[PDB]
Amino acid sequence: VPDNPPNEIYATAQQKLQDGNWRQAITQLEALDNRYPFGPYSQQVQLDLIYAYYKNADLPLAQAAIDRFIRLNPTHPNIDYVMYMRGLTNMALDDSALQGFFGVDRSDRDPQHARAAFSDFSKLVRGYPNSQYTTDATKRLVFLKDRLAKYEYSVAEYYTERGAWVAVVNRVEGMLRDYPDTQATRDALPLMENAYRQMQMNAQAEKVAKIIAANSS
Amino acid sequence: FNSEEDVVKMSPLPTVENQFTPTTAWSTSVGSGIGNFYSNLHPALADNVVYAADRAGLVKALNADDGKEIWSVSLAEKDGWFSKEPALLSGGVTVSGGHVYIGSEKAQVYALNTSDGTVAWQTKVAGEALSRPVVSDGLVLIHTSNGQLQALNEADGAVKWTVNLDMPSLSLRGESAPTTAFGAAVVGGDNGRVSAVLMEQGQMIWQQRISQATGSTEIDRLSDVDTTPVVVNGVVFALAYNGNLTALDLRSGQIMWKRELGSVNDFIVDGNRIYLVDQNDRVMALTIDGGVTLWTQSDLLHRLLTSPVLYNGNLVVGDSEGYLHWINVEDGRFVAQQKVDSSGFQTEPVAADGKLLIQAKDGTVYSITR
Amino acid sequence: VVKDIHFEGLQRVAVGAALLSMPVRTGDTVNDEDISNTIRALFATGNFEDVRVLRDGDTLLVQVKERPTIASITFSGNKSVKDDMLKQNLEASGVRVGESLDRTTIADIEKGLEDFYYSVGKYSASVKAVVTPLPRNRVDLKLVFQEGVSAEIQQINIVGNHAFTTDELISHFQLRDEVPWWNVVGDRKYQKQKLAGDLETLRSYYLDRGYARFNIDSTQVSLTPDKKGIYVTVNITEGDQYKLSGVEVSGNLAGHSAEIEQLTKIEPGELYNGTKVTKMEDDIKKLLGRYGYAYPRVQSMPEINDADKTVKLRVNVDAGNRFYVRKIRFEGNDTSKDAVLRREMRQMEGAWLGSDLVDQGKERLNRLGFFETVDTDTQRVPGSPDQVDVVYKVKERNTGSFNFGIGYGTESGVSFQAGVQQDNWLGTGYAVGINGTKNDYQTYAELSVTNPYFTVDGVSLGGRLFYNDFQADDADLSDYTNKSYGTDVTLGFPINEYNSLRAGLGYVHNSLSNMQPQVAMWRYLYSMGEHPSTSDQDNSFKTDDFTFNYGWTYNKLDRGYFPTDGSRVNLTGKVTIPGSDNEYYKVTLDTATYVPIDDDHKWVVLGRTRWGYGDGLGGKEMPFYENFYAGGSSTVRGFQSNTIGPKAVYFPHQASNYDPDYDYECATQDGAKDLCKSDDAVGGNAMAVASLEFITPTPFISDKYANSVRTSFFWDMGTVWDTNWDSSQYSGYPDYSDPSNIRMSAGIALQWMSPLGPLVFSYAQPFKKYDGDKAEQFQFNI
Amino acid sequence: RVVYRPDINQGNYLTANDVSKIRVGMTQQQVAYALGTPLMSDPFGTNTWFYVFRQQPGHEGVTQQTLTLTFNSSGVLTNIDNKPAL
Amino acid sequence: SSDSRYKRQVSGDEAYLEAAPLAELHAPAGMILPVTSGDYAIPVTNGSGAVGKALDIRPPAQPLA
Structure with missing residues (x-):
């Protein structure tokens, strides 16, 4: 961890970064970013260093940096970058695990960081539809959308897996007036009718049968 | 570990050249028992009769004569809330003859009138006896650290001249004895708020206080000053809570004028000369002309106990570790020689009846004479 | 009379901006008062001040430097405290170190730290630091501070106690006047807080005595300036017993006051002890939250009557509301099943209210151990007189x-x-x-x-x-x-x-x-x-x-x-x-x-x-x-x-x-x-x-x-x-x-x-x- | 064969006073004041509330008082319907 | 941060093409109702850009001085 002049140490940083010496790269990047918090070299170190965080997977520290800087400077065409990176930090904070490699039974866990990220990327794609990542942030958003969808679907399903129909019906109507297109929803549609006849909400089962026989073929 | 502090230590006792020699240390010991606990009780050579006592509820009349132990009484209420109700006293020794009045920090006061014996009237008082009473004009005046200022009657008592002062929230351990003249009682303070009472209902003549005190933007723990006004000619010379020389030339009323000078320990008035110690533990002298100081001293800097007493042209000084330091052929006279105890010393010395009078932190008296 | 005014070494503002910022310019006869005006303008900057205003003949040399920044760090002497805590207190007090720190502020911060030591009722002997002016503009402080540690110094003093013995009352107190160790279960170190504690300690106790009248005592913390002498009293004024007699209830509720006085079973002539009615009261609150009405209004006054030491109890209790629940929400199982969490419950969201079932499920969790935080954060929804919202935070054992x-x-x-x-x-x-x-x-x-x-x-x-x-x-x-x-x-x-x-x-x-x-x-x-x-x-x-x-x-x-x-x-x-x-x-x-x-x-x-x-x-x-x-x-x-x-x-x-x-x-x-x-x-x-x-x-x-x-x-x-x-x-x-x-x-x-x-x-x-x-x-x- | 089914409840408990004091015309606000804001209300459709009270112990029978309401777009008590004990 | 990976593929699989694009559910006759109620707003006018992870997430060139 040197304290070389910002030019030299920033060059060696870029070397270790396009290299991928994430640990030492981050050490020296932080060394510069603190040795001078100000200067184009400094804020370049800032963006490259939050990049080396989120890739080195310093997602607590990554969110720390992104939000500390939106405090430090709130708007930029890197609010493309900033919104994207803070949302994506929330995202891989939701998805920081090894089952993400084993790859079985995901997305029914927490979306709270993921909803922070949906807000983030959405404010982006609407206030910044002008980015190199716009439709990629959209890929984020659609993933996150169907993701939280099937999450809550699993959850309400579990609730009725105990057997109490009424609250599950509440959950599913809520998610309905939220975003009723994900297959989580269309698959949730059997749940309400089953619950209805179980609660003997016969006519309500009929009405939801109409709306699904519409939505279904 | 609890005491891991690099505080300034004793600038040691100097060479012991003193052609003046301590010809006596007349011994006698009630043996008690002060240890190191806080108070200033002190010898009073009442007709050279020494009603001696110490920190248990012990008493015995003695005499500056080899001290025969007279009038020994058990001084504790074996009745009441407790057996012997452990007798512990932060109230100086007072008598009028054998009328040994005293008041206890336990909010109790007593007149051991050993002019007639143990005719002592118990007093459950407002406040706690922390300062010395003042037997003036048939009255008694004290400073409890209750902020209050009462007055009573010798051997009988009655609440009167009721006054109250202000406190620092830190509730500093300060006290102040009033200095009266013509019924104009001039007392010191602890918040620096100073008053001068005419006992009308105990009414003051005052509009001011010393700008210097402790408690909020606090100061050194070496501005230690025995807060008590000393009035000569009506010219009250003040000894401000912080090192700040002040002269209050009272003239049929309260007059103030602060001829400032730091280093407040206490002072002795003798005409145009003062013989004082500085708060930083060094002994000065001064001419009363605005504050012209004299009398350098550094050999005994930051010695712990300082207790001087002047008699036979000898401002004899008492320090702890049972040492005795002597002032003499006054400056350039600064050298000292004696150490009669290792029991150490802790309180004020008096030179009464031309004799010297001393207590040891434990053990009554080892009567040293020039 | 100056003609061309120059400024070299600015690096932050323009030379011409420097000239125009100070109210002096080329074309005004600069006298001593004008030099002083340049000086006071340099000083009006607030962020940076350095006057080197040289003037020989017809030219004005003004030179200014900036002390920012110093990163004062090396708090050394940390033996019962940590340097980080010192930095945190400074930043919280407003001395966060991205710092100019003019030569003045040194003693300010030294003695501020010291004063906080003393606020602990402790003491720091000396605090002197070392300057490290890193040659860009950075500086740091080798903050070598010494201690005057003064903690276990207690000696206790009570006055006004006349119905119970002083030391009996001193017994129950934390701050303990330096008793030996071999009976140790606990600690006794001073604090102004710990004082207030002890105060309320005997307060609570003596008022559980039934001795009503005591409420008054002037606090007076004696202080020997010798690291140990704190022989403190407070002048209390003990009170008076009564005898608890009579029952009158105001059940402003859907009707259980029969069961209320059935609960508040107070036979006549009983003894006056606020703890008893406290407990009964509690039971009542339980019974009430038991019925959904867990948001009551309740008050009782002791009709403490003298010449008879009688104390009747006027009470008045007002029902809350029956059915609330809106949300049952959990924060924390981001890599854990929440199915298991809501599996540790018994009742259905969307029913009438009972604080029982919720604390039941929560303590069911804690019965499963395996984690180290209850958070039963339970607010009503902002936006309805009903519909309470619950949040659950745990810290998890693995x-x-x-x-x-x-x-x-x-x-x-x-x-x-x-x-x-x-x-x-x-x-x-x-x-x-x-x-x-x-x-x-x-x-x-x-x-x-x-x-x-x-x-x-x-x-x-x-x-x-x-x-x-x-x-x-x-x-x-x-x-x-x-x-x-x-x-x-x-x-x-x-x-x-x-x-x-x-x-x-x-x-x-x-x-x-x-x-x-x-x-x-x-x-x-x-x-x-x-x-x-x-x-x-x-x-x-x-x-x-x-x-x-x-x-x-x-x-x-x-x-x-x-x-x-x-x-x-x-x-x-x-x-x-x-x-x-x-x-x-x-x-x-x-x-x-x-x-x-x-x-x-x-x-x-x-x-x-x-x-x-x-x-x-x-x-x-x-x-x-x-x-x-x-x-x-x-x-x-x-x-x-x-x-x-x-x-x-x-x-x-x-x-x-x-x-x-x-x-x-x-x-x-x-x-x-x-x-x-x-x-x-x-x-x-x-x-x-x-x-x-x-x-x-x-x-x-x-x-x-x-x-x-x-x-x-x-x-x-x-x-x-x-x-x-x-x-x-x-x-x-x-x-x-x-x-x-x-x-x-x-x-x-x-x-x-x-x-x-x-x-x-x-x-x-x-x-x-x-x-x-x-x-x-x-x-x-x- | 299992020993027992415990008894379990469902929200919108009903009492005689609550359902008796109400009557056609009372506005939704006073109606809630009478009964409460029911967690059982229809989002797309008329201002209808249902008030079910349901409990089934020990494999036993049916207990169902389903009190379905109907209000106008303004919200006025009218055409109220219940089926006590199924 | 990588195991000879993590250049032009999002961590693990990319559902960029496994996910569900918009599948307009016809609001039936009288089943008209708030289709959504939240932050779910997107301009269809976008791209044509990063479908699947192949885009330059890596830091593009900007002026140092």
């Missing part, structure tokens, strides 16, 4: 129990035994226990996994595997060539919501051969009716056990790994049903029910002990593979493994399917070919252990790790003997037919348990007058 080991393979290849224990099994709520031992001569298998829930209620089904190849033959045989293929599946049925009653089964195969010269084996064989040889290890056996299993468990346990005041009992018993190839009767019991002497529970006790008895069913006996042993374990520390148990003697087996030379001593070819009294813990058919321990997390540890660090001391008792025992065959040999086998050891216990693994350092010097002690005062349990 489990991993996985074992590592290879070798020592010295005469063998590096040995291979495996043990894995992932229960609450991290993939699910299952519970995985798999044990394998393959050291070059053994294939002993063990497998066990079990679900937490399988039916609409949550039944836990558990199967168990264990295959055995236990031969370890010295050369080829006469070395107990053994195979054992055992299986069992397990269930549980508690419907008390407390205690599981059970009825289960278990299977095992056993292949035997290659006996040993111990009497005990042949004793058993004959007891079954098998006639073995006497000078020959020439016998074997095969069996399959069709034996019933019955057990039970209790639970009211207050924590888990670092428990408190726990209460749990668990029974297990084994009887062989008809249809088996073996018969034996075995019952077993253990218990862990604790109670704390510390009620912050920083010091809790252990009551834990077990018992087991084996015997046969009609005609047969409890097989030796079912006997009871002990030693050198976290049941009795300090021994070698399984050291406890009776001794079975060798018999001469001088021709034992190649009775060998130089092995199987004590009556082989090489060894003393005659009879033997053999020293070997063969285990008894009756068992019981005694051990009583104390959670003693020492003050000696820097008490900042409490989820992993734990400290204790131990004692143990041991004795195991045979009940089916004789002396007509054990006369010349010692006898174990009786509880006679006492062992005793005591010692220390520390556990800085990484949640992934504990390393149990186990030193136990056994002190009991008893033989056969084959010991190891060093055990490292994992």
Whole structure:
């Protein structure tokens, strides 16, 4: 961890970064970013260093940096970058695990960081539809959308897996007036009718049968 | 570990050249028992009769004569809330003859009138006896650290001249004895708020206080000053809570004028000369002309106990570790020689009846004479 | 008169901007007052000030520098505090160090830190720092501060106390006037807070006396400026008792005031004690939240009447609202099932209100232990008179129990035994226990996994595997060539919501051969009716056990790994049903029910002990593979493994399917070919252990790790003997037919348990007058 | 064969006073004041509330008082319907 | 941060093409109702850009001085 002049140490940083010496790269990047918090070299170190965080997977520290800087400077065409990176930090904070490699039974866990990220990327794609990542942030958003969808679907399903129909019906109507297109929803549609006849909400089962026989073929 | 502090230590006792020699240390010991606990009780050579006592509820009349132990009484209420109700006293020794009045920090006061014996009237008082009473004009005046200022009657008592002062929230351990003249009682303070009472209902003549005190933007723990006004000619010379020389030339009323000078320990008035110690533990002298100081001293800097007493042209000084330091052929006279105890010393010395009078932190008296 | 004004070395603002910023310019006659105006303009900057205003003739040299920035850091002297805390106090006070720090502010911050030491009622002797002006503009401070530590300095003083003795009242107080240590349970260090504490302490107490009138005392903190002298009093004015009489209730509610005064059952002439009515009141609030109306308005005044010391109680209670619930939300199980969390509940979201069911589910969680935070954050919805919202935050305890080991393979290849224990099994709520031992001569298998829930209620089904190849033959045989293929599946049925009653089964195969010269084996064989040889290890056996299993468990346990005041009992018993190839009767019991002497529970006790008895069913006996042993374990520390148990003697087996030379001593070819009294813990058919321990997390540890660090001391008792025992065959040999086998050891216990693994350092010097002690005062349990 | 089914509840408990004091015309606000804001209300459709009270113990029978309401777009008590004990 | 990976593929699989694009559910006759109520707003006018992870997430060139 040197304290070389910002030019030299920033060059060696870029070397270790396009290299991928994430640990030492981050050490020296932080060394510069603190040795001078100000200067184009400094804020370049800032963006490259939050990049080396989120890739080195310093997602607590990554969110720390992104939000500390939106405090430090709130708007930029890197609010493309900033919104994207803070949302994506929330995202891989939701998805920081090894089952993400084993790859079985995901997305029914927490979306709270993921909803922070949906807000983030959405404010982006609407206030910044002008980015190199716009439709990629959209890929984020659609993933996150169907993701939280099937999450809550699993959850309400579990609730009725105990057997109490009424609250599950509440959950599913809520998610309905939220975003009723994900297959989580269309698959949730059997749940309400089953619950209805179980609660003997016969006519309500009929009405939801109409709306699904519409939505279904 | 609890005491891991690099505080300034004793600038040691100097060479012991003193052609003046301590010809006596007349011994006698009630043996008690002060240890190191806080108070200033002190010898009073009442007709050279020494009603001696110490920190248990012990008493015995003695005499500056080899001290025969007279009038020994058990001084504790074996009745009441407790057996012997452990007798512990932060109230100086007072008598009028054998009328040994005293008041206890336990909010109790007593007149051991050993002019007639143990005719002592118990007093459950407002406040706690922390300062010395003042037997003036048939009255008694004290400073409890209750902020209050009462007055009573010798051997009988009655609440009167009721006054109250202000406190620092830190509730500093300060006290102040009033200095009266013509019924104009001039007392010191602890918040620096100073008053001068005419006992009308105990009414003051005052509009001011010393700008210097402790408690909020606090100061050194070496501005230690025995807060008590000393009035000569009506010219009250003040000894401000912080090192700040002040002269209050009272003239049929309260007059103030602060001829400032730091280093407040206490002072002795003798005409145009003062013989004082500085708060930083060094002994000065001064001419009363605005504050012209004299009398350098550094050999005994930051010695712990300082207790001087002047008699036979000898401002004899008492320090702890049972040492005795002597002032003499006054400056350039600064050298000292004696150490009669290792029991150490802790309180004020008096030179009464031309004799010297001393207590040891434990053990009554080892009567040293020039 | 100046003509061209120059500024060099700005680096932050323009030379012309510097000229225009100060009210002076080219073309005004600069006199001394004009120079002073340039000076006061440079000083009006507020961020940076440096006046070097030189003027010789017709030119004006003005030079300014900027002290920013200093990064004052090196708080050194941190012995009861941390530098970080100093920085945090500075930043909170507004002295966060991105700092200019003019030469003035040094003493300000030194004495500010010092003043805070003193705010602690402590003291810092000296605080002097070292400048490090890093040559860009950075500076740092080597902050070397000295201490005047003054903490345990108490001496207590009470005045106004006239109905209870001073020191009796001083007793209950934390801040303690310097009493010795050996009675220590707690601490006494000063604080203005701790003062206010003590104040309210006796306040509460004396007002629980019923002595109403005391409310007044001037606070006066005496202070000797000598690090110790604080002899403080406060002038109290004690009060007056009454006698509590009468009931009048104002139940402003859907109607339970009959049940109210039924609860507030206050017989006439009772004694006046605010604690009593406090409790009754509480009960009422319970009963009220019990009915949904958990948001009441309630007030009672004591009609404390004098000349009669009567105190009537006017009360008035107003119902809350019946039904609220809106949200039941949990924050934290981001990598954990929330299905399990809402599985730890009982009621349906969207009903009428009861604080019971919610605190029930929450403490159900905490009964499962395994995590370290309750958060029952329960607000109403902003935007309705109804619809309360709940939030749940926990901090989670984790489990991993996985074992590592290879070798020592010295005469063998590096040995291979495996043990894995992932229960609450991290993939699910299952519970995985798999044990394998393959050291070059053994294939002993063990497998066990079990679900937490399988039916609409949550039944836990558990199967168990264990295959055995236990031969370890010295050369080829006469070395107990053994195979054992055992299986069992397990269930549980508690419907008390407390205690599981059970009825289960278990299977095992056993292949035997290659006996040993111990009497005990042949004793058993004959007891079954098998006639073995006497000078020959020439016998074997095969069996399959069709034996019933019955057990039970209790639970009211207050924590888990670092428990408190726990209460749990668990029974297990084994009887062989008809249809088996073996018969034996075995019952077993253990218990862990604790109670704390510390009620912050920083010091809790252990009551834990077990018992087991084996015997046969009609005609047969409890097989030796079912006997009871002990030693050198976290049941009795300090021994070698399984050291406890009776001794079975060798018999001469001088021709034992190649009775060998130089092995199987004590009556082989090489060894003393005659009879033997053999020293070997063969285990008894009756068992019981005694051990009583104390959670003693020492003050000696820097008490900042409490989820992993734990400290204790131990004692143990041991004795195991045979009940089916004789002396007509054990006369010349010692006898174990009786509880006679006492062992005793005591010692220390520390556990800085990484949640992934504990390393149990186990030193136990056994002190009991008893033989056969084959010991190891060093055990490292994992 | 299982020993027992415990008894379980469902929200919108009903009492005689609550359902008796109401009558056609009362506005939704006073109607809630009478009964409460029911967690059982229709988002797409008329201003209808249902008030079910349902409990089933020990494999036993049917307990169902389903009190379905109907209000106008303004919200006025009118055409109220209940089926006590199924 | 990488195991010879993590250049032009999002961590693990990319559902960029496994996910569900918009599948307009016809609001039936009288089943008209708030189709959504939240932050779920997107301009269809976008791209044509990063479908699947192949885009330059890596830091593009900007002026140092």
